[PDB]
Write a protein that binds this DNA or RNA. Structure first.
Length: 50
DNA sequence: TGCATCCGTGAGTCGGGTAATAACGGCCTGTACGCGTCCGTTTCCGGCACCCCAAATGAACCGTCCCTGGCTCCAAGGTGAACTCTGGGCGACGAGTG
């Protein structure tokens, strides 16, 4: 599924659109350390992804 | 009444073909073939009695497949805010630096 289909918010949508993360398959493949490396990452984004 | 004298029986299996003598006119005809002429056949040009036959020549024709009128009734486009990152700019502080 697309991550946006999970009814996410402004910062997460902008991060997935500018960078190019499209499906939750790559998110479930990527670990928490591999996803928190992004700069200007939001604590709310971390909480919702967790 | 033997006795020789034939006499007639029989005796296995999957390169070819090799020749004389005196014979010779003369006449008849029988069938197949050739010549010339003649005639039924058939084969092809032409005409109306008309048989008309026909695509081509005049309508509608009107329902339908094209235009115009305008009316809407809604979702795309334009209008705010604030806000939550997003980022720029800013100040603080130090231990390797001088």
């Amino acid at each position: 599924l697309p991550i946006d289909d999970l009814d996410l918010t402004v910062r997460s949508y902008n991060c997935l659109k500018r960078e190019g993360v499209h499906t939750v398959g790559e998110l479930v493949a990527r670990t928490e350390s591999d996803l928190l490396d992004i700069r200007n990452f939001g604590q709310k984004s971390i909480d919702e992804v967790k």
